[PDB]
Design a protein around this motif. Structure first.
Motif, mmCIF file in Angstrom:
data_model
loop_
_atom_site.group_PDB
_atom_site.id
_atom_site.type_symbol
_atom_site.label_atom_id
_atom_site.label_comp_id
_atom_site.label_asym_id
_atom_site.label_seq_id
_atom_site.Cartn_x
_atom_site.Cartn_y
_atom_site.Cartn_z
ATOM 1 N N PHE C 1 9.444 6.624 4.685
ATOM 2 C CA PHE C 1 8.026 6.403 4.950
ATOM 3 C C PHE C 1 7.824 5.914 6.378
ATOM 4 C CE2 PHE C 1 8.322 4.885 0.315
ATOM 5 C CZ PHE C 1 8.435 6.186 -0.132
ATOM 6 N N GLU C 2 6.816 6.466 7.046
ATOM 7 C CA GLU C 2 6.509 6.146 8.435
ATOM 8 C C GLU C 2 5.323 5.196 8.482
ATOM 9 O OE1 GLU C 2 6.845 9.188 7.247
ATOM 10 O OE2 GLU C 2 8.654 9.973 8.208
ATOM 11 N N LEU C 3 5.434 4.161 9.307
ATOM 12 C CA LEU C 3 4.417 3.125 9.414
ATOM 13 C C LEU C 3 3.576 3.363 10.659
ATOM 14 C CD1 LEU C 3 3.270 0.458 8.264
ATOM 15 C CD2 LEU C 3 4.915 -0.732 9.716
ATOM 16 N N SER C 4 2.258 3.288 10.501
ATOM 17 C CA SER C 4 1.356 3.487 11.625
ATOM 18 C C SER C 4 1.514 2.367 12.643
ATOM 19 C CB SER C 4 -0.090 3.546 11.137
ATOM 20 O OG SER C 4 -0.969 3.873 12.199
ATOM 21 N N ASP C 5 1.494 2.738 13.923
ATOM 22 C CA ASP C 5 1.587 1.788 15.022
ATOM 23 C C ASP C 5 0.281 1.655 15.796
ATOM 24 O OD1 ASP C 5 1.475 4.195 16.322
ATOM 25 O OD2 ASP C 5 3.337 3.943 17.451
ATOM 26 N N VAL C 6 -0.822 2.167 15.259
ATOM 27 C CA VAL C 6 -2.123 2.084 15.903
ATOM 28 C C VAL C 6 -3.042 1.259 15.011
ATOM 29 C CG1 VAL C 6 -3.062 4.193 14.870
ATOM 30 C CG2 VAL C 6 -3.933 3.396 17.091
ATOM 31 N N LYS C 7 -4.127 0.764 15.605
ATOM 32 C CA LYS C 7 -5.094 -0.027 14.856
ATOM 33 C C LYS C 7 -5.612 0.755 13.657
ATOM 34 C CE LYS C 7 -9.353 -2.695 15.309
ATOM 35 N NZ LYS C 7 -10.447 -3.146 16.204
ATOM 36 N N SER C 8 -5.625 0.103 12.498
ATOM 37 C CA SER C 8 -6.086 0.753 11.281
ATOM 38 C C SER C 8 -7.592 0.970 11.336
ATOM 39 C CB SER C 8 -5.720 -0.088 10.060
ATOM 40 O OG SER C 8 -6.516 0.267 8.942
ATOM 41 N N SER C 9 -8.019 2.205 11.076
ATOM 42 C CA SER C 9 -9.448 2.488 11.014
ATOM 43 C C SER C 9 -10.103 1.739 9.861
ATOM 44 C CB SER C 9 -9.672 3.995 10.881
ATOM 45 O OG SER C 9 -9.139 4.485 9.665
ATOM 46 N N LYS C 10 -9.445 1.701 8.707
ATOM 47 C CA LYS C 10 -10.007 1.027 7.544
ATOM 48 C C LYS C 10 -10.079 -0.476 7.794
ATOM 49 C CE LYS C 10 -7.290 3.849 6.306
ATOM 50 N NZ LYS C 10 -6.708 5.071 6.923
ATOM 51 N N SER C 11 -11.129 -1.112 7.279
ATOM 52 C CA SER C 11 -11.263 -2.556 7.389
ATOM 53 C C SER C 11 -10.716 -3.242 6.139
ATOM 54 C CB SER C 11 -12.723 -2.952 7.592
ATOM 55 O OG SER C 11 -13.385 -3.100 6.349
ATOM 56 N N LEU C 12 -10.360 -4.518 6.301
ATOM 57 C CA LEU C 12 -9.624 -5.232 5.258
ATOM 58 C C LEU C 12 -10.379 -5.224 3.942
ATOM 59 C CD1 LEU C 12 -6.838 -6.511 5.987
ATOM 60 C CD2 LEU C 12 -8.346 -5.969 7.869
ATOM 61 N N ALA C 13 -11.708 -5.273 4.000
ATOM 62 C CA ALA C 13 -12.484 -4.989 2.802
ATOM 63 C C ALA C 13 -12.082 -3.641 2.220
ATOM 64 C CB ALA C 13 -13.977 -5.017 3.125
ATOM 65 N N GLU C 14 -11.966 -2.623 3.076
ATOM 66 C CA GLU C 14 -11.631 -1.284 2.602
ATOM 67 C C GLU C 14 -10.200 -1.215 2.077
ATOM 68 O OE1 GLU C 14 -12.530 1.610 5.560
ATOM 69 O OE2 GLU C 14 -13.200 3.121 4.118
ATOM 70 N N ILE C 15 -9.236 -1.782 2.808
ATOM 71 C CA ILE C 15 -7.847 -1.740 2.350
ATOM 72 C C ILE C 15 -7.705 -2.465 1.018
ATOM 73 C CG2 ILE C 15 -5.492 -2.501 2.837
ATOM 74 C CD1 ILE C 15 -7.834 -1.851 5.741
ATOM 75 N N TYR C 16 -8.319 -3.639 0.897
ATOM 76 C CA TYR C 16 -8.151 -4.408 -0.327
ATOM 77 C C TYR C 16 -8.913 -3.777 -1.485
ATOM 78 C CZ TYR C 16 -5.360 -8.414 1.052
ATOM 79 O OH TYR C 16 -4.323 -9.236 1.423
ATOM 80 N N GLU C 17 -10.025 -3.095 -1.204
ATOM 81 C CA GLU C 17 -10.706 -2.355 -2.259
ATOM 82 C C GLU C 17 -9.864 -1.174 -2.724
ATOM 83 O OE1 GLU C 17 -13.621 -2.605 -3.987
ATOM 84 O OE2 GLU C 17 -13.904 -4.640 -3.213
ATOM 85 N N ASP C 18 -9.220 -0.476 -1.786
ATOM 86 C CA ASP C 18 -8.312 0.603 -2.159
ATOM 87 C C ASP C 18 -7.163 0.071 -3.003
ATOM 88 O OD1 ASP C 18 -7.487 3.547 -1.625
ATOM 89 O OD2 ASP C 18 -5.688 2.418 -1.073
ATOM 90 N N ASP C 19 -6.659 -1.116 -2.662
ATOM 91 C CA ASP C 19 -5.675 -1.772 -3.515
ATOM 92 C C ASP C 19 -6.256 -2.051 -4.897
ATOM 93 O OD1 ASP C 19 -3.569 -3.128 -4.596
ATOM 94 O OD2 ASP C 19 -3.551 -4.761 -3.129
ATOM 95 N N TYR C 20 -7.503 -2.525 -4.947
ATOM 96 C CA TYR C 20 -8.147 -2.807 -6.226
ATOM 97 C C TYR C 20 -8.321 -1.535 -7.046
ATOM 98 C CZ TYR C 20 -9.414 -7.751 -5.536
ATOM 99 O OH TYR C 20 -9.390 -9.118 -5.394
ATOM 100 N N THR C 21 -8.733 -0.447 -6.401
ATOM 101 C CA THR C 21 -8.928 0.829 -7.079
ATOM 102 C C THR C 21 -7.742 1.757 -6.836
ATOM 103 O OG1 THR C 21 -10.249 1.570 -5.178
ATOM 104 C CG2 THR C 21 -11.444 0.782 -7.122
#
Ligand code: MG
Ligand code: MG
Ligand code: MG
Ligand code: MG
Ligand code: MG
Lengths: 56, 211, 21, 127, 182, 283, 8, 96
Positions: C1-21
């Motif tokens: 798996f490759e890890l992104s080295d640039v700023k994430s477009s998604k915001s932490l609300a978005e990342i954590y909601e994706d984790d929730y769903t």
RNA sequence: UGAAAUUCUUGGAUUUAUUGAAGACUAACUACUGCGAAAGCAUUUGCCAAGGACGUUUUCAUUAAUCAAGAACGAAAGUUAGGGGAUCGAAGAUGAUCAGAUACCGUCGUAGUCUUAACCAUAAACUAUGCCGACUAGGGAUCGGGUGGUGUUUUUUUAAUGAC
RNA sequence: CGUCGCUAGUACCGGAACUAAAAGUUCCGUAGGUGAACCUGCGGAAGGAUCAUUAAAG
RNA sequence: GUCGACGUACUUCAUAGGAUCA
């Protein structure tokens, strides 16, 4: 070098003989390993108290 | 087997008359078998905003020591002053010089105390330099002026009068006016007041202070 | 798996909601 | 009609303390720690420990008579970190949710002017 | 829901970004949290108070206070908005000095090592651990969930102690894989 | 793990073991068994102590189908934890982590081997080989020289091992002296430990430590108890007596101003005898 | 800017 | 100006060969991608070729190249690349 | 701690508060900016002497540059003899020896860390870059001094200084 | 479905009885080192990858 | 003694790069 070596060996033999002249056990004697501790736990204190009581 | 609060009793603290709001809450203690011995020597620290009813003093705290007890009223006296840590961290900033002075002096009532004052240089209206560092000579001159002012104010006053001066921050105005010509300054404050020694207790002076 | 080295477009609300769903 | 307390929160790396005492600070009303509210030592510093700890102290305070508390959060300080950790924050949030009135929040971490040497050593610590 | 107040002092270097972003700050505070907002120019601090008639969530006032505090520490606005949205986000803070006494060029290089070229090394850590890191000079703040921040702190500390970025990046992939597994 | 592959050094090791045909060989760290086959070839029988079951099994397969079957014996376990059979010669390439215990265990075997060839880290080997007055002279040097004599056989470089280690190696010969000198191990070790805290300071300064005073005073109390003479047991009762005793012995032996690192065997033995004379027993 | 310097 | 001053200062101190090497490659890529550098007309090539032939500054008779070569220093890869990077650059100027 | 275990603890540990004692160190302000031949140098105040640069229509008139011999100082560690001994801490002991991102962790801690009188004279003692002298581009920032303005603020009587 | 086993337990005179038994980073100086394929203390260096914000006496 | 340090003398490992073509 050989002659000093032999003289040293004779001195060693005499000293070791005189050491056997005077010898004791070491079980009760506290080892020098404790030199670094400088403070004893309650377990160690209880062990020391038990040992001393056994000695009297 | 005993819930301690069954044997506890409540007591109400009162503040100096120098402060506007005498009511500063309440405390509790084990009931006398005496309670007074436990009460004496107790200190309570409270923000000046609560006592004066103004948010302008929100960054200032006063320590008051319980000195007498009468009928569930705990009569206290001024014991110390300090600022809030957040305010101090706010004042200290990069690109400026911090000048601090401390003076040991006794009041007219033989209250030996220690005053710590702090100040910072500032840039003027037409300044274009990034920073406003002051030469060591200016720092020393300002420190001498501040020390002299603090000593004069404390010596020529009583402790109650001293607090009466601290509350309106007149001393800061006098300091900035005196040190104005030496170098422009900002955030001039009496940072801290410590009470080193106490004279012999006089209950009369406490009752008269409390009216 | 490759890890992104640039700023994430998604915001932490978005990342954590994706984790929730 | 509103009697005040002081909620002293000590947020260390491995546990959180919630300690409520009178305004003077001399007499403690209720002390609860993350250790008592959790089965494993690892989760003592966990926020989940803190919220359980905070709720219990709040429940006791209502019983005694305390309705408002001034919060004085702190960390280990000294030669170690000067900022309260998540455990302190979680407890503070619980106190607000508990219904006790929060008078004033202030940081009183022990901050040294200049301190002794730290435990880690030259090469550092906390791998 | 009783009448209460909170104050958070914004440092000088952040308030202009507050001016830059405040159009998007008061709306969520006032509509969702039902929180009555203000900041004092004289003191340069944001004042939040609970309005007893309209406010309903008891934790709203503290939630807003942490939201501004998140913004105050240097976190971007949308990153801070997650704090309002969620309830299990906390901020971890520590200095480089606690990890190791680094001064002069050693200190500067340590800060550079954490950030990485063009911020890639920081961008590495944030995504793998699902957190955000603010490198305020020698001051580090990490925002996220409790378990999440601890992995982030470990990697940052490893860089401070001298671990080269490459080996740190490899470990991040490993833990990143385990995060997807769970 | 690191594996040797230069045949010449191993051949030299087995040759310098000088194993007589009636000898039983304790071969520690079998590994693959490059040394083991040659030891088996010129030995009565071989006992091998392996920690990894897989390596022992591989050795069994390697030897299987040869004349030397009945000779080989493989023990599985941790070398220290196991109680070993009688052995005549010890040849080891064991992991260096166990270098120091290994040595002393060979010294404290009920019937110690007459000869052993041991591979040790270069720094460790030099410390074993250090002579009085050398920079690396230490407690290990003095103790091992009491109970044995150690000589240098080879210097083994990094390239021989794969994967390369970060330190060089060497091979030495250890000779346990028979008869064992009649000095108590504990007393010798205690004296050396007290005297070697900082080997480049005066022996007196070595004794000036307060904890050393406490230990020696307790030892004096215990000894006086053994001889049925009464003792008060107060903490500082004979601090002033033991202090004078130590001062007098140090002065008369003339070892007070001599650094421990430059002291030989006879100097330490004289010091031990003097301390005994005045009544202090160290361990 | 609604509430820059006043309650909003 | 102060911010650029501090940033420029910090970069000046870093004198790591690899760090500069990365930076130079990236700069060349951007300049080539942006075509910032104007094309060389036939005259510019001719004058450049003339000077190179005139001096022969890009052959192993130079001091640094000779010193590296004569003492078995160019057996190493990294120095060999640098000696190479010099040589190919000379060859480019020699191209017609 | 990754989890435990040595460790302290109903004789009250941890935590709270009122103090008292000991020994170090001078945070934030703090910046490759400042000083010093270098090593190095950071709380307030006093005393002792020392120094660069600036200003000078003052003074001597080659008194100067470099430097084998020789001399003063020389980070940290280290040695001798006293003192002190808080924190940290080589060595030593001891708990655990399960799991590889957290794989070297914990507790006690001798010498040392501090200081006084002498030794030792080594560092990536780095600008991996001798010393003195001259010359060879533009640009704005800073530290110290000096010159100039009919420039701002201040002296809240002017002003003169101070700061811009 | 039987016999004796092996493991644990209970008793009896090696023997002889009974019960149970879901498994298959790179260094320098100095000082040390007795679980040393290397570790550790003190001081120093980069010969080691700078993202964001930043007049708020505005 | 298949010893340590130094001195001396030798051995050895690190060489391919660009363009075209298949
Ligand atoms: Mg300065
Ligand atoms: Mg001393
Ligand atoms: Mg000298
Ligand atoms: Mg230096
Ligand atoms: Mg010049």
């Amino acid at each position: 070098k050989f002659i000093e070596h032999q003289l040293k060996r004779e001195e060693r033999k005499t000293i070791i003989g005189k050491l056997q002249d005077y010898k004791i056990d070491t079980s009760l004697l506290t080892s020098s390993k404790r030199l670094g501790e400088g403070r004893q736990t309650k377990k160690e204190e209880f062990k020391e108290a038990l040992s001393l009581e056994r000695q009297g | 087997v005993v819930d301690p609060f069954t044997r506890k009793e409540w007591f109400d603290i009162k503040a100096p008359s120098t402060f506007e709001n005498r009511n500063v809450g309440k405390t509790l203690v084990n009931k006398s078998t005496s309670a007074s011995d436990a009460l004496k020597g107790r200190v309570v620290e409270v923000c000046l905003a609560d006592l004066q009813g103004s948010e302008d003093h929100s960054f200032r705290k006063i320590k008051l020591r319980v000195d007498e007890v009468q009928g569930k009223n705990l009569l206290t006296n001024f014991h110390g002053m300090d600022f809030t840590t957040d305010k101090l961290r706010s004042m200290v900033r990069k690109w400026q010089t911090l000048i601090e002075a401390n003076v040991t002096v006794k009041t007219s009532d033989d209250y030996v105390l220690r005053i710590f004052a702090i100040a910072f240089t500032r840039k003027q209206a037409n300044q274009v330099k990034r920073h406003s560092y002051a030469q060591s000579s200016h720092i020393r001159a300002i420190r001498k002026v501040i020390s002299e002012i603090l000593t004069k104010e404390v010596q020529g006053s009583t402790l109650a009068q001293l607090t009466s001066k601290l509350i309106p921050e007149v001393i800061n105005k006098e300091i900035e006016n005196a040190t104005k010509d030496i170098f422009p300054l900002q955030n001039i404050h009496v940072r801290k007041v410590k009470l080193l020694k106490q004279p012999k207790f006089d209950v009369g002076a406490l009752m008269a202070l409390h009216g | 798996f490759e890890l992104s080295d640039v700023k994430s477009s998604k915001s932490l609300a978005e990342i954590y909601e994706d984790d929730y769903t | 009609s509103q009697v005040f307390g002081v909620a002293r929160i000590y947020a260390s790396f491995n546990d959180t303390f919630v300690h409520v005492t009178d305004l003077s600070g001399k007499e403690t009303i209720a002390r609860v720690t993350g250790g008592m509210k959790v089965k494993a030592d690892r989760d003592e510093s966990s926020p989940y420990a803190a919220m359980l700890a905070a709720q219990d102290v709040a429940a006791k305070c209502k019983e005694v008579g305390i309705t408002a508390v001034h919060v004085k959060i702190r960390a280990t300080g000294g030669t170690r970190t000067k900022t309260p950790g998540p455990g302190g924050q979680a407890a503070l949030r619980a106190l607000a949710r508990s219904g006790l009135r929060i008078g004033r929040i202030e940081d009183v971490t022990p901050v040294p002017s200049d301190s002794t040497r730290k435990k880690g050593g030259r090469r550092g610590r906390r791998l | 829901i009783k009448f209460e107040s909170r104050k958070i002092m914004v440092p000088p270097h952040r308030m202009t970004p507050l001016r830059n972003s405040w159009t998007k700050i008061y709306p969520p505070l006032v509509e969702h949290l039902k929180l009555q907002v203000r900041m004092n120019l004289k003191t340069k601090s944001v004042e939040l108070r609970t309005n007893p008639k309209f406010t309903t969530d008891p934790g709203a006032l503290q939630k807003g206070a942490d939201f501004i505090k998140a913004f105050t520490l240097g976190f971007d606005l949308d990153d801070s908005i997650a704090l309002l949205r969620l309830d299990d986000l906390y901020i971890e803070t520590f200095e480089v000095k606690d990890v190791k006494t680094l001064t002069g060029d050693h200190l500067s290089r340590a800060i550079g090592r954490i950030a990485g070229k063009d911020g890639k090394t920081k961008f590495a850590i944030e995504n793998a651990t699902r957190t955000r890191i603010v490198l305020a000079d020698s001051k580090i703040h990490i925002l996220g969930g409790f378990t999440h921040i601890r992995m982030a702190r470990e990697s940052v500390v490893s860089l401070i102690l001298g671990s080269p970025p490459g080996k740190v990046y490899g470990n991040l992939r490993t833990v990143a894989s385990r995060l997807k597994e769970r | 793990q690191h594996i040797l592959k230069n045949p010449l050094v191993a051949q030299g090791i087995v040759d310098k073991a000088q194993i007589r045909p009636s000898d039983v060989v304790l071969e520690v760290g079998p590994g693959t068994g490059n040394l083991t086959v040659r030891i088996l070839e010129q030995a009565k029988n071989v006992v091998a102590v392996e920690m990894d079951p897989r390596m022992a099994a591989e050795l069994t397969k390697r030897v299987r189908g040869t004349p030397v079957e009945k000779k080989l014996e493989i023990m599985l376990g941790d070398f220290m934890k196991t109680e070993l059979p009688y052995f005549d010669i010890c040849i080891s390439n064991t992991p260096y982590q166990i270098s120091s215990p290994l040595v002393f265990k060979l010294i404290n075997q009920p019937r110690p081997p007459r000869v052993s060839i041991l591979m040790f880290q270069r720094e460790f080997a030099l410390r074993l080989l250090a002579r009085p007055g050398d920079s690396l002279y230490c407690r290990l040097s003095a103790n091992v020289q009491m109970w044995a004599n150690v000589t240098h056989i080879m210097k083994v470089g990094k390239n021989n091992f794969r994967p390369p280690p970060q330190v060089e190696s060497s091979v030495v010969r250890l000779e346990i002296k028979n008869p064992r000198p009649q000095v108590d191990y504990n007393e010798w070790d205690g004296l050396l430990r007290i005297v070697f805290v900082r080997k480049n300071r005066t022996i007196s300064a070595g004794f000036k430590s307060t904890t050393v005073m406490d230990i020696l005073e307790k030892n004096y109390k215990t000894f006086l108890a053994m001889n049925n003479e009464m003792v008060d047991d107060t903490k500082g009762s004979m601090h002033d007596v033991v202090k004078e005793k130590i001062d007098t012995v140090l002065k008369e032996t003339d070892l007070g101003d001599k650094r421990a690192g430059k002291c030989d065997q006879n100097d330490f033995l004289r010091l031990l005898y003097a301390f005994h004379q005045v009544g202090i027993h160290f361990s | 800017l609604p509430g820059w310097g006043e309650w909003a | 100006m102060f911010r650029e001053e501090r940033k420029a200062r910090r970069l000046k101190k870093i004198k790591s060969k690899t760090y500069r090497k990365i930076k130079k490659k990236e700069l060349m890529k951007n300049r080539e991608l942006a075509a910032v550098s104007s094309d060389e007309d036939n005259e510019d090539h001719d004058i450049a070729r003339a000077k190179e032939r005139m001096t022969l500054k890009h052959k192993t008779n130079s001091k640094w190249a000779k010193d590296m070569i004569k003492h078995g220093m160019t057996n190493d890869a990294e120095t060999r690349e640098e000696m190479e990077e010099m040589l190919r650059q000379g060859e480019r100027l020699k191209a017609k």
